[PDB]
Each structure stands twice: as structure tokens, then as C-alpha cells.
Amino acid sequence: HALLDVYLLENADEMSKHAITIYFLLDIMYSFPDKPDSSIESFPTAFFVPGSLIKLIQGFWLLDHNDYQNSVDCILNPASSRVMSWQHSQIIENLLCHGDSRQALRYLQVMKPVATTSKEVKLHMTVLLANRSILEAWNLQRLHSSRLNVEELLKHMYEMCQEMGLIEELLKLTFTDFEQGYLHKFLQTTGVQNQELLLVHHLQRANYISALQLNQSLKTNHLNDCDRRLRERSGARNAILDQYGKILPRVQRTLASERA
Amino acid sequence: QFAECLMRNCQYTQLQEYVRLLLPWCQVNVGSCHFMLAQCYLVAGEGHKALDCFSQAASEVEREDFLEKLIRVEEGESVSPRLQYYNRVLRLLEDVGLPELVIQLATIAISEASDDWRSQAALRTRIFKHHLDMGHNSQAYDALTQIPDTSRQLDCLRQLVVVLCERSQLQDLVEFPYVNLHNEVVGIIESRARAVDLMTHNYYELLYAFHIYRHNYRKAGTVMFEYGMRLGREVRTLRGLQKQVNSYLAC
Amino acid sequence: MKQDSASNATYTVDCEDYVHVVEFNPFDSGEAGSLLAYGGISYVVIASCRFQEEDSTVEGIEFKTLKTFHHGERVVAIAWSPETRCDALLPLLRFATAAGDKKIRIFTSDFQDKNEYKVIEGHSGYINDLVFCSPEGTDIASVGDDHTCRIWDLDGKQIAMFILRSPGMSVAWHPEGAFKLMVAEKTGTIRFYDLTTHQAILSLESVQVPLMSADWCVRNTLRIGAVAGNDWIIWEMPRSSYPQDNKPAHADRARMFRWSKCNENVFATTGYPGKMKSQIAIHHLAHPQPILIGTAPVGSGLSWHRRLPLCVVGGYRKLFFWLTEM
Amino acid sequence: GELEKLHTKVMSLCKWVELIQCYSAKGRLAQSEMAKRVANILRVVLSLQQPPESMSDSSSEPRVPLRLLAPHIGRLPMPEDYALEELRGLTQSYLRELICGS
């Protein structure tokens, strides 16, 4: 009678209540399947619910029972009414939590979910970066980099690419001065190891003067540190910088001719 | 045979009216339906709705022996029936000719190509080529950066320098900084510069400017002095005299 | 395709996105100058453009973006209502779109940070065309792939429904008329609807099929232009139920026909999009040959300036402008 | 059986290239010519020690002995003409060395 009173409630959609009843009837059927055919299966045609929604409800059943593959198949089945953005978001987040990156990517590629919110963009780029679609991720980032969302997008990309190790791929793209400036600002205050990594990035973009300034800063910093692995790496680094700076253009040569 | 005859007799309008009457109650051959509906869309000039029709069609192709034949139009690999779908649709896209539709279809198709790295290289190569054809050279470069296959890399580098010269945007290739590659690029450019005539362009001054870009005074001076050498060997005009003067000047 | 007086764009505008749809303001602006709008895949940009044709202070073209709005599914058609305002303390905006969702969405804006949205329901088959059917526009007529012509209100309610023989490709407002609408069918049937009484008045028959794009003459009512098969056709009222004049428009599948918003003899056509770096063919009447040809690497959108004989075609991240005769 | 001797004696005499003392401009010039030639031949041999039909290691990127080479090679100057390419190779060397440092 509680299910029945749902009909007595404010009906936003008869199809919603029909889908609830159909899901309950399917649960009844799978509780004890008797006979290979039933007139209860005739309920959706009796109450005139689209086969699109029928296949959808099948997908909802399968996803609830964690048959994600069959649920995705039923959802991606064509001639199906497109589902709503909230359940897009929950579906994709659950799939990523469960680790079904390929399935979530298939969902996104077929259904083509909407994205007009920073959260939507972050979720979609998360799926794409877990599935190695770095190029399209960066492209849509550039597209939707508003004056309000750009730094959030950058921070999210930095964290997630740090987690799954796409650094050399990322280093091979066209960029902008603001992006590199924000990168430098973020990485400058984030510890020594990030200092040597961004040193590597300077050298990768051929930034030798700045690399040497960072090296001077690190050497000045390491005058009270006493870790032996750090001492090994720092002696290596001192040999490195003595090798490099003397060959570079002459400004640092004049600075070396200057007393220290 | 009904839909086959609607194709044959050019009855495209009859086609869409048929398929619209059939689809919502007929949940078989839906991929084919989306197919030839997209065919009419490209025919009339709404190939983007055509692309979405193919996007929805790619989900189920397993049945309809007619459809299965289109997996047999792309044999040798079975990474995904979606992937043979992708190869066939890209083949028709190259037969007919919307490069940007190809571009986005591929940026999507990267998902179903999980294996056979030759396919990945060829697809990003095609991305590169279309980006250049429309001048989208920045993300042409970006697409190239994921090509490790050195043979395709050499083909792309040769066609790259060719189109860069044709369009006079070499300086961008230089404005891109890199690591450990000037050996490659100098090999390519000198291979071209020695092979071609000097009066088309001073690829020597080109490389000299690169030398300036790379702070290499030794090699720069040598390049400019040797170009003065070449001019003195070749031409004997007073304009040329000023030119070798400038050459030795810069050296 | 057509090739006669081929030339580069008189004006070229460099954008940050490829051009999906782009078109001017038809009429009724609160201030001088032409507003224009282009929608791509996730963004729609409205910008006011000034030409050295109009202004002497503006040299070449001064295009200044009024707004870029974040939309969802890619916009495939945009409906202007000729009632918008550019003057006073509040610029009125009430503009509709059809996106890659088969749905229609209405947006109202004031530059005062208020913008709300009315999504307008669809029907069977995609929305082929949609236009405001009032001289200021308050109601929209849409044609789709169900052979139904459905008139909607701003609230989203069926103002009307007309049963067509074949799915309608194009629906056209008569700015010179008053609730005079055309509905075009692929079979080649042109129907004039008097939306004031919902009584269908006159019909036209085209011998070239399929029929997808047409227009009234902007400075005349007896002249009706269209593109069918591969040729452009003009009918003269009230003496035709068949082509009065028919001359080749584009050898390939010509797509769009437009009439100059200041000429009753100059019109523009587009080739079949993309492919061969599609050409805009600007034609003058009594000339099978086009009086102007312009090149756009892809054929996307065709617009006429409100009172200049200026035609704009979009392309890859660019806009191209060509000026023509009276 | 002679390639191993090549490696052993080459990497050793690298240690004593440092003690070369030039008291003339032409002496140091010949020293520079030697350095550039030894760099060239060292590149050639390090490339060809994995012969095109009898590869020694499958795909392994071994740890470079620059951890021993650098403290002695850093004791001499180098002409930026080919010091550029040498120094660049040394750059990607130090990149892996430091990403796999102590």
C-alpha cells in the first residue's frame, strides 16, 4: 500500500511511477522465475511505457546488481531516450570508483554526456586521463579555460597527471605563458624534490639561466640539511652545474668572474 | 532487400521515411538504420548529424550479416567491431572528404584502438596531416609528438618541412623549443639545402638564424662565412660583393 | 560549385573556435551597427561588428564581443527574434536555438546578469528549421522530420500544428508580411500559411527535387527564391505554379539560398559544404553566372547584412565577408 | 674477446685523459682535436657494441658509468662547437641519473 500511495503523491511523471512499478515487478520475477513467459511482462505495453525506458530499466537493474557490462550494453543500445546529467555523473563516478575505466569511456563516447560545469569537465577529463586521452583532455581544457575555471583545471590536471605518470606526454605540447607561470609558482613553494623536477623541466624547455638560479637556491638551502642521499645527489648536482654554467652564454661567466 | 533497393533506386527520401516508420518499434538493424540515415545526412550536407548517427550506430553491430560484412571489409585485426566500424567510416570519410569530421571521429576512435600501434601511429599521422592542411600546425605538432615510429616520423618530417616552406611558417618550428633533436632537424634541412638551389631561399641564413636562437656563435659564424664562400664561388655581381661582406661581417 | 569573379574575403575575422553556425541581426536593433552571433559546439558568442562601409572611425572591421555563453550540446541552428534592443539601460535579448539534442531552447538576457532558459519540446524527426513568425517575433515556427509544421509559444506550448505531405526542410518568416509563413517540403511543395487565421493561402510547385532551402525576396514579395536539385529558382507571383526562372546555382549539391537584406535582385548561395573548399556564389538576377565567388574552406552558414549588400560565410575558425552590388 | 678489452682499456684511459698537460696553444689545440675525435669514436663504439644482428642486451637501459666519468671529465674545458651535442647527450644522461638518484 505504500507503493500504491506513491501514485497518490504528486505525480511529476507517470513514466517515473511506471518505471518504479516495472522495476518492482522485475524484482518479483527474479525472486522466483516460474514458467518461461508471463503476462506480467505485458505490463509495460499495458501502461504504454516506451521501449527506450524499458531497456533503460533493464540497465538500471543490471547496474544495481553490478553487472556493469550488461548494464552498459543495454544503456548504449540505440533508440534509447537520453538519461539525465545527474545520473550520468553518478554512473561515471561509481564506474571510476569500481575501476571500470574502459566501460566509463565507452559510456562517454557513445552517449556523449553534457559538460558545462567545472565539475562536469573535471569528471570527464578524469575519465579521459585514466583512459589515456590526454590530447582531447588538454584540448577541452583549453576550450573551457575561462577566467574563473582555468586555475582549477590546471591544478586538477597537475595532481592527476602526477598520480598516473603522463609527464613526458604532457611535456610535448603547445602551451601558454600563463600556464607555465602558474606552474612555476605552484612548484616553487612545494619542496626540494619538486625543485629538482622543475629544474629538469627548465632544461627540457632549454631554460639554463633559470635552471642555474634554481641550482644556486637549492645549494644555499642545502647548507643545513645532512641527509646522505641528499648529499650524494647534491654533489652530483654541483658537478652538473659546474659543467653546464661555464659553457652557457657569457652572463653567468661574468657572474662567475664576480667574487662570491 | 527493401532497404537495398531504396539505396539502389536513389530513393533517399523514401529511405528516411521508411526508417523513421520502422525504428521505434524495430530494435534490430538499428545500426544500419543510423548508417544510411547518416548517408542521407552527408548527401544533403548535414554530415555532423550523420556523424552522430554513426556514433549511435557503433554500439551494436554484432547481428545483421549485412553489418557483419562491414567487419569483414576490415580484416587482419579484431580489437573491436567498433574498430572495423571506425576504419570503414574513416575510409568513406577519405573517399568523400570532410577532414574535420575525420579529425573528431578519430579523437573518439582512439578508445577502440587499444592494440596494433600501427593504427595509432597512422591515425595521429592523419590528424597531423589534416591539421597542417587547415594550418592547425600547433596541434599538428601535438599529434606528431605521440608518433614513435621513426619511419612514419621521417615521412612526416619531410612532408612537414615541405609544407612549412610552401606556407612560409618555418620560424614556428624553431620557436618550438626541444631537447636533443637539432641533429635530426639539421640533418633534414641540410639534406634539403644541399639538394635544392640556393636562389629559391637562403636555407643557410635560415639555419644561421637557428644558430642565433641556440646561442651557438661558433657554428653560426661558420655557417655565415661558408655561405659567403658559396656566394663567392657562384655569383660575381657587386650586390653579391655586398652579400659576402655581410657574410664575413656576421661571421 | 561556381567560379566567376572569384576573390578572397573582403573582410576576414579570426576566431578562437571553428564556426558551426553564424548569422547577422536581421532588423530592429536598438542601436546602429550590426550585431552578429556564432554558436559552435559548447559556446555561443554574440559580438557587435562595425565595417568601414558603415563607419569611417571604424577602419576595416571593428568586431567586439558582447558575450560568450557556455551552452551544452552543439548548437545547429539559431533563431533571431527581430525585437532585440541595444539602447537604453537594458538590451533585450530573446533568442532561440536548436542543438544536437533535437530540442529547442529559448534564452532571454539583459546584460544585467539575468539569463534564464526555456527548453522547447521536440517532435518526431529532427528540427529541420525554425524562425520567429512575427515582425518582431514572439512565436516560432519549426519544421521537422515528421511532416508536421509546429508553431510554439515562448512557454513551449503548441501554438499550432499543420500536417505536411513530407518532412519540412525549411520554414521562413516574411518580414515584409504579417504572419505570412512559408513551409518547404522535399517533394517540392511550397506552402504559404496565414498564421493570423491559420488559413493556408497559396502554394508553389518545384520541378527540381529534393527541395530544402528557399527565401522570400527581402525587397519584394512577388519574388520567391530557392535552391533545388543543383540550380537556383525564382518564382514570380501570381503567375507560377512552376519555375518562372531557373539557372544553375552550384554544380555540386547546393545547400543554402539567401536573399540580400537590401537588394531585390542580388542573392547568395553556398556550395555543398567543405570538400572542395566550398564557394559562396553571389548572383545577380538575369545572370546564370555568379557576379561574385568567395572561398571558405568549409561551407558553414550564410548571412546577409541588415542593410549592406554584405554576405558572410563561416569556415575553419574564421569568418569571411564579401560585399556585392545593389 | 677483444671488444671486452676495448671497453676495459677505453674506460680506464678516460681516467688519465685528465692528466694531459698542454704547455702550448698548438698542444692544447691537438688536445682538443683528440677530445673531439675520442668523443666521436666513443659514440660510434657505444652505438655499435650492440651489433645490428648480434645484440648484447635485449632492451635494457643500464645505469651509466658517468657516476665515475664525471668527476674526471669535468676537470677540462670544452669547445662549445661540439660541446653542445656532447653536453646535450650528457643532459639526458643526468636526467635519468637524477630521476634514479640516491
PDB file of N, CA, C and O in Angstrom, chain B residues 179-183 216-219, chain D residues 79-82 84-85 88-89 92:
ATOM      1  N   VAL B 179      64.617  19.236 -26.875  1.00  0.00           N
ATOM      2  CA  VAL B 179      65.873  18.682 -26.390  1.00  0.00           C
ATOM      3  C   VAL B 179      66.363  17.582 -27.325  1.00  0.00           C
ATOM      4  O   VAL B 179      65.602  16.710 -27.757  1.00  0.00           O
ATOM      5  N   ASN B 180      67.647  17.667 -27.665  1.00  0.00           N
ATOM      6  CA  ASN B 180      68.455  16.598 -28.246  1.00  0.00           C
ATOM      7  C   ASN B 180      68.133  16.324 -29.717  1.00  0.00           C
ATOM      8  O   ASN B 180      68.552  15.295 -30.258  1.00  0.00           O
ATOM      9  N   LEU B 181      67.402  17.223 -30.372  1.00  0.00           N
ATOM     10  CA  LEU B 181      66.900  16.964 -31.716  1.00  0.00           C
ATOM     11  C   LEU B 181      67.491  17.841 -32.823  1.00  0.00           C
ATOM     12  O   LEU B 181      67.080  17.666 -33.988  1.00  0.00           O
ATOM     13  N   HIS B 182      68.388  18.801 -32.538  1.00  0.00           N
ATOM     14  CA  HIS B 182      68.759  19.680 -33.646  1.00  0.00           C
ATOM     15  C   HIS B 182      69.568  18.868 -34.627  1.00  0.00           C
ATOM     16  O   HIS B 182      69.624  19.173 -35.812  1.00  0.00           O
ATOM     17  N   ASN B 183      70.242  17.840 -34.128  1.00  0.00           N
ATOM     18  CA  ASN B 183      70.936  16.922 -35.012  1.00  0.00           C
ATOM     19  C   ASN B 183      69.996  16.393 -36.081  1.00  0.00           C
ATOM     20  O   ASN B 183      70.295  16.499 -37.276  1.00  0.00           O
ATOM     21  N   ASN B 216      74.813  29.504 -30.357  1.00  0.00           N
ATOM     22  CA  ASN B 216      75.996  28.804 -30.848  1.00  0.00           C
ATOM     23  C   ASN B 216      76.741  29.696 -31.840  1.00  0.00           C
ATOM     24  O   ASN B 216      76.617  29.583 -33.061  1.00  0.00           O
ATOM     25  N   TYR B 217      77.540  30.595 -31.277  1.00  0.00           N
ATOM     26  CA  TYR B 217      78.354  31.504 -32.070  1.00  0.00           C
ATOM     27  C   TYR B 217      79.345  30.794 -32.987  1.00  0.00           C
ATOM     28  O   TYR B 217      79.510  31.214 -34.137  1.00  0.00           O
ATOM     29  N   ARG B 218      80.001  29.726 -32.527  1.00  0.00           N
ATOM     30  CA  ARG B 218      80.916  29.017 -33.420  1.00  0.00           C
ATOM     31  C   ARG B 218      80.204  28.589 -34.699  1.00  0.00           C
ATOM     32  O   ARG B 218      80.567  29.023 -35.802  1.00  0.00           O
ATOM     33  N   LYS B 219      79.175  27.753 -34.561  1.00  0.00           N
ATOM     34  CA  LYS B 219      78.510  27.200 -35.734  1.00  0.00           C
ATOM     35  C   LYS B 219      77.864  28.299 -36.557  1.00  0.00           C
ATOM     36  O   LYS B 219      77.863  28.237 -37.793  1.00  0.00           O
TER      37      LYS B 219
ATOM     38  N   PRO D  79      85.137  22.913 -26.158  1.00  0.00           N
ATOM     39  CA  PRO D  79      84.675  23.916 -27.127  1.00  0.00           C
ATOM     40  C   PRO D  79      83.201  23.762 -27.457  1.00  0.00           C
ATOM     41  O   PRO D  79      82.747  22.697 -27.878  1.00  0.00           O
ATOM     42  N   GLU D  80      82.468  24.869 -27.326  1.00  0.00           N
ATOM     43  CA  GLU D  80      81.015  24.832 -27.446  1.00  0.00           C
ATOM     44  C   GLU D  80      80.566  24.422 -28.842  1.00  0.00           C
ATOM     45  O   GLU D  80      79.364  24.258 -29.077  1.00  0.00           O
ATOM     46  N   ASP D  81      81.504  24.258 -29.775  1.00  0.00           N
ATOM     47  CA  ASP D  81      81.143  23.784 -31.106  1.00  0.00           C
ATOM     48  C   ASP D  81      80.485  22.404 -31.055  1.00  0.00           C
ATOM     49  O   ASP D  81      79.314  22.261 -31.423  1.00  0.00           O
ATOM     50  N   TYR D  82      81.205  21.384 -30.589  1.00  0.00           N
ATOM     51  CA  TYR D  82      80.613  20.069 -30.369  1.00  0.00           C
ATOM     52  C   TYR D  82      80.327  19.795 -28.897  1.00  0.00           C
ATOM     53  O   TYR D  82      79.650  18.798 -28.585  1.00  0.00           O
ATOM     54  N   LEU D  84      78.256  21.348 -27.445  1.00  0.00           N
ATOM     55  CA  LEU D  84      76.800  21.379 -27.449  1.00  0.00           C
ATOM     56  C   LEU D  84      76.195  19.988 -27.512  1.00  0.00           C
ATOM     57  O   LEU D  84      75.417  19.620 -26.630  1.00  0.00           O
ATOM     58  N   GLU D  85      76.534  19.203 -28.530  1.00  0.00           N
ATOM     59  CA  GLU D  85      75.871  17.916 -28.686  1.00  0.00           C
ATOM     60  C   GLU D  85      76.313  16.955 -27.596  1.00  0.00           C
ATOM     61  O   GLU D  85      75.500  16.202 -27.038  1.00  0.00           O
ATOM     62  N   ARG D  88      74.460  17.957 -24.504  1.00  0.00           N
ATOM     63  CA  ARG D  88      73.058  17.579 -24.570  1.00  0.00           C
ATOM     64  C   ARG D  88      72.878  16.099 -24.257  1.00  0.00           C
ATOM     65  O   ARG D  88      71.991  15.720 -23.473  1.00  0.00           O
ATOM     66  N   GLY D  89      73.688  15.245 -24.888  1.00  0.00           N
ATOM     67  CA  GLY D  89      73.655  13.834 -24.524  1.00  0.00           C
ATOM     68  C   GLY D  89      73.873  13.646 -23.038  1.00  0.00           C
ATOM     69  O   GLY D  89      73.163  12.887 -22.369  1.00  0.00           O
ATOM     70  N   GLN D  92      70.509  14.426 -21.144  1.00  0.00           N
ATOM     71  CA  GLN D  92      69.515  13.371 -20.930  1.00  0.00           C
ATOM     72  C   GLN D  92      70.102  12.279 -20.055  1.00  0.00           C
ATOM     73  O   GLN D  92      69.367  11.556 -19.373  1.00  0.00           O
TER      74      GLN D  92
END
